[PDB]
Each structure stands twice: as C-alpha cells, then as structure tokens.
Design an enzyme around this catalytic site. Structure first.
Site, PDB file in Angstrom:
ATOM      1  N   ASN A  32     -46.426  73.833 -72.187  1.00 40.62           N
ATOM      2  CA  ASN A  32     -45.497  72.714 -72.145  1.00 40.62           C
ATOM      3  C   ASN A  32     -44.933  72.501 -70.743  1.00 40.62           C
ATOM      4  OD1 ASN A  32     -43.652  70.687 -72.799  1.00 40.62           O
ATOM      5  ND2 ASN A  32     -42.080  72.164 -73.420  1.00 40.62           N
ATOM      6  N   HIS A  91     -40.348  63.665 -73.303  1.00 37.68           N
ATOM      7  CA  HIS A  91     -40.847  64.925 -72.750  1.00 37.68           C
ATOM      8  C   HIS A  91     -40.714  66.095 -73.733  1.00 37.68           C
ATOM      9  CE1 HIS A  91     -42.104  67.283 -69.301  1.00 37.68           C
ATOM     10  NE2 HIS A  91     -41.012  68.027 -69.306  1.00 37.68           N
TER      11      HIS A  91
END
Lengths: 271, 271
Positions: B100, B250
């Site tokens: 991530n 995000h």
C-alpha cells in the site's frame, strides 16, 4: 450454424437472438467487425453468465442474421431503437447491458435516452467518446473479403497472434461473405470513417449525467479503440470502475475469458 | 491495543506483526502516514484473505510498534532487508505481496532484488515511480500533531469525507503521538520531500524486467499519489492488470473493502 438462434420481431425488424438463463436480464451487444454476430462475440460469455442471469444476445440490425431492411436508415438512434424494441418484445423492463466496442457506444446512448430501462453497464473497448481514428479501425471497417485480409484483422483484434490460425481466418472469412453481409458492411462505415466514431459517441456533458454503476474494460494493447478512450470514459462517468488487462487486445471477452467473466458476474452480483 | 500483535526478531530488529490463516503466504505492507501500523491499514483485509491464505502483516521498521533502533539508517534497501528478514524469520520462502503506497514501492524493490522470493504482487496507490510531489503527500509527510491536522489528513486520504468523524480523528491523533512516533515520523521524510518519492521509486528499466503477475489498484480521486503514477506502472509492468475505483481515494482497502478483497483474493486464487 450456431450463430443462428431464435427469431423475434423487434422495432419492426425480424431479429436473430440468443436467450439463455433465468433471473435478472443482461443484454449483450456485439461489436462491428465484418462477419460479426452475437454468437461470435459472446459464445464464451453466455455460458458463464447464464448460470446466474437471463442473458439476451441479439444481432443488431445490419449485422449477423437479423433482417437487413431495404433502404434502412442506420444510425446511433436507430440502433438504440432496435435495442429498446428487443427489450419491449421480450417484456424486459430493466436490464444490465454489456456493450462491446460499437455495442458500448450503443449501450451509453441507450442509457442516456432510456435511463429507466438500464441498470448497470459494462463497456468494453467501447465507442462512446470521440477518439482519433486508428489504422486498426480503418482496416476493420475498410475490410474487403479474403483470408489474408481477415487474418490481418484477426491479428489487429488480438494480443496473442498465435491464436490466429488458418482455420479461424478461413471460418471468419466465410462468415464475412455470407449472403448480403459484405454488401451491408462495406456501406455501413464508408470513408471518412472519423464521422462514424463521432456519430457513435455521446457528448461529455451527457455522459457525465449517467447515474449507472459502470464497469469499463479495456485491453492495454487494443489496436482498434485506444486505451485513452476508456480512460476518458472513466473520467466522465461518476460511478465507474476501470479494469485494464495487460497483454490483451480488442477481444477481451475471448482473450481473458475467465478473468472477464469473473469480473462481470461479480459486478452484476453487487446489484 | 489491537495494533500490537506478535513479536519476532527480523533483520536484527524486534518486529511487531500479525500472522493469521494457513496456506500460501501473503505479505501485506502498510503505507507511510503518521500513526500508521499494519493493523490500522489491514484490519478489514486480513479477515477476508486469511480465510484462504496465511496473511502476514508486519510494522515496518520506523513505523508502528516495531523497534526504532537508535541511529538506524532508513532507506529503500534497508526496508527491503527488513521485509526479507521477516520472511526469513518465518521460513517464508516465496510469497505474494500486497503493498500500500509506501509499501507498494517496497514491494517493487523487493521483487527486483529478491525475484525468487516474490510471486504475485498487488500495488495500491503505490510508490515506485517518480511522480511530482502533491500537496496531499506534502501535508501527510509534513504532519505535526493535532486533531485538526489529523482530520485534514483523513480528508485527504478518503473520497467520502462523511467517514471522517471526530472520533476517528481523535483516535488517529492519539496513535500519532504515542511514545517516539512523531519523533521518528517527522525525521523520516524531511523537506524537500520530492527526494523521498524518488528514493522509493524504481527505474523504468528495472520495472520493465518484473516477470510477476501484478495487480495495480488506484482510486480515481487519490489526492496523495496521482492516478497517473499507476497508469505509468501499468505501462511498464508486462503481466499487469489495472483496476481503478471511481469515488475512491488513497484508502482503497477501507473505502471499497468488499470490491478490493474480492479482486485480490481471486487474483491470488489464479496462481
């Protein structure tokens, strides 16, 4: 000929179509290559989706085995009328729509004119936005019959050319020369072909109004419709998802069958 | 504190980590925001994936509850060494990796230096390519503690701001001021921050050599890492697929949890 299925009068046109499965209706709309038919496009898609949905795959007027009315006026709106006519004929009040290329443009146009008849949409290497004509598309729409010309188109459609065999070229060539096929095809998208990309497109303003959950699919290596076109659709459609397959051309449902089917089924299952 | 899990010595660093499930190993690598931890990032991912895989989620050195060695030299290579150290400590010979953002850059770097240790990769709003620093990222890495500053960062991370509650801001603010957290964070990515985006990136030439099946995920509205960065990764990695979620920022694994989990599990199932 497995490309010939059932027959029904839709929007005044005798229409060839396939209808498999039960439950939530899903309309599959094929592309616009020479010799195209609903079966040719969706033969590997119907079996997977029909296990959970009622799948309807018609040959759009001017293509496949649907009647080609004398002096018929082909247009984006006329094709939308055909889709709606098919749905009306089958008492399909609301359905999901999967549009492949040419069919993607029709799917968008149908959702805009008949929003209440369309639920979720899947747009694959779809028409719908104004993109500059590609040599691949000009070759596809400018096709003249021959096994070599068809081989070239098959090469243009797929990423893995090893899949383009002499047998496949032969069979698709034969499909393209069936009675009246090439005659209607060659007169469908005459030069300059940019006019038809534009005619099949919907305005940015209109596309932005689409409320439908939409899944945009594209092959990174698509030589017919540029990836940039789907990126644009992704910027315009609010409830959208974009899935781009690397090592994949303009034949996603066939090139990445299992991945494609899984994505589409789960997408509709969400509804 | 559920963010504290198991402890193990890896690459000479006492490491905090979570290990749930059995079978094929999957390493989850968190991002680089203030107060971040493996649990904070993956709390909704582990339960889903651990049903079919052995999921390992460690706190990278310098983050979470892993030891912060005095005078430790933080770098892309050092972090890769930590990941490999964790795998070695757990006898994980080859694993899939989900990275991530910051973790995505580490995943790419690990696959390049230890190709034989990495199978499939999932890169989410990932670092890995040189993109121009965004105000969102500068705000994230330039964070100073306060509930209002954390609220702003939470707004920057997600698409649906209604999810940013006073309670969430309070809890994450508290996480960011834990002993030694802000001290190590503020000294981790000092101005000019473009240097760190570049340091975490891998060269175009190197990325092109990656043989791994890769799934690139990004939120259309990501304010921290631009979508353009993932489009670039998609152009560079051969066996790649890109999935962009509209109405998503995000924080994809949290914002589009069910879609994300389904995509990742099916992607790994393919192996």
């Amino acid at each position: 000929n497995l490309e010939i299925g059932k027959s029904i009068l839709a929007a005044g046109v005798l229409t060839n179509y396939h209808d498999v499965g039960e439950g939530q209706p899903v309309i599959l709309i094929h592309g616009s290559g020479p010799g195209v038919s609903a079966y040719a496009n969706w033969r590997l898609t119907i079996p997977a989706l029909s296990k959970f949905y009622r799948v309807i795959a018609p040959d759009m007027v001017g293509f496949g085995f649907t009647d080609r009315p004398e002096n018929y006026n082909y247009s984006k709106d006329s094709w939308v009328d055909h889709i709606i006519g098919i749905m009306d004929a089958l008492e399909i009040e609301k359905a999901h729509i999967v549009g492949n290329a040419f069919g993607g443009g029709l799917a968008i146009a149908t959702a805009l004119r008949y929003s209440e008849r369309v639920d979720r949409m899947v747009l694959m290497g779809a028409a719908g936005t104004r993109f500059d004509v590609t040599e691949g598309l000009n070759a596809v729409w400018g096709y003249t019959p021959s096994i070599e010309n068809m081989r070239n188109l098959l090469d243009i459609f797929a990423y893995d050319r090893s899949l383009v065999t002499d047998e496949l070229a032969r069979l698709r060539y034969e499909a393209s020369i069936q009675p009246g096929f090439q005659e209607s095809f060659s007169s469908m998208f005459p030069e300059p072909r940019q006019r038809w990309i534009d005619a099949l497109a919907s305005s940015d303003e209109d596309i932005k109004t689409l409320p439908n959950e939409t899944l945009i699919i594209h092959g990174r290596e698509d030589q017919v419709v540029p990836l940039s076109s789907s990126l644009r659709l992704g910027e315009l459609i609010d409830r959208a998802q974009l899935h781009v397959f690397g090592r994949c051309g303009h034949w996603t449902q066939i090139e990445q069958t299992d991945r494609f089917n899984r994505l589409v089924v789960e997408f509709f299952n969400e509804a």
